[PDB]
Amino acid sequence: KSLKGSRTEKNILTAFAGESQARNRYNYFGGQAKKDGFVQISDIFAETADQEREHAKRLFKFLEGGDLEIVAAFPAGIIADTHANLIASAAGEHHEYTEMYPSFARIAREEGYEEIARVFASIAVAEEFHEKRFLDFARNIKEGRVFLREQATKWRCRNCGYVHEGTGAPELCPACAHPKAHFELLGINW
Template sequence: MKSLKGTQTEKNILTAFAGESQARNRYDFFAAKAKSDGYVLVRDIFQETALQEKEHAKRLFKFLEGGDVEIVGAFPAGIIGATEANLLASAAGENHEHTEMYPSFAAVAEKEGFSEIAAVMRSIAVAEAYHEKRFLALAKDIKEGRMFMREKATVWRCRNCGCLVEGTHAPEMCPACAHPKDHFEELNYTF
């Protein structure tokens, strides 16, 4: 691959790297808040997504060639709010990445002759779209009071021990390991 030095693609990679790195940290902070709010599934989704953002950052970082690169960017300062608000803020960030940032960065990379980088950026955008979808689904369930209840009987799985319980509501306590309700998820939860 030809050198990135001095290209707009180099600047875009560093901008994306910074954004992915910051998102990872925000998601770790939001995971702790979700746990304290009683949403273990949401905590786990934030933690999983944080690791995926780290992998995006790592993949992009490997394209860089060292040295100092000056970039100008705006990044969300954000706050740690209630879990529903954190999910919605996260979904908005993911939406920006997959609808605006990565498509435009990929187009620039293609124009500058970096097809491999463009392909990576388009692939990352696909993951970001899924992140947005999950965050929005979880926020909706919290808003509607559906994290631990359904209209029809379903199977609830304890995320701690794997115990399965059937009903319209997750049990207040796992009958197998005695963990509280916040450790339950619908067995076939789809986003």
């Protein structure tokens, strides 16, 4: 059935507006992470922004045209240090998966928009992992564990692929001469 005049129609636009802003915020935080010397985290922010772009696209495609007025609150700023940005980002993700999406999904179901409700619920799952990443990285920064660990492990240079074995990433990559900022724990997800 058509969405015209429904609460779900406005909820979709509200979600689209929020996700659009989140995309920008995450890209800015990504740039700041770069300046703060956290390349992996910078790329994580950039990827999250791209994924918010996709959540927004799915939502946008449900709309059927025309200008619609919405009333909603959003983060008025700001760009701080990377740890602070990760904390604020996690809080935003938390709101989305614990409050916004579940509420929007329930209303969608109430109004008879099952497919849309399922999409809202599905997006919430992605947001929960987004929060996890942001919280995990914030914790690594706070504990001084971004580039140094208790036991020896493997570190990979994101710039050239060099693999370093040790308790911590080197000050300079011996292969490409790029700074420690480019290193991450070697990951294998396959």
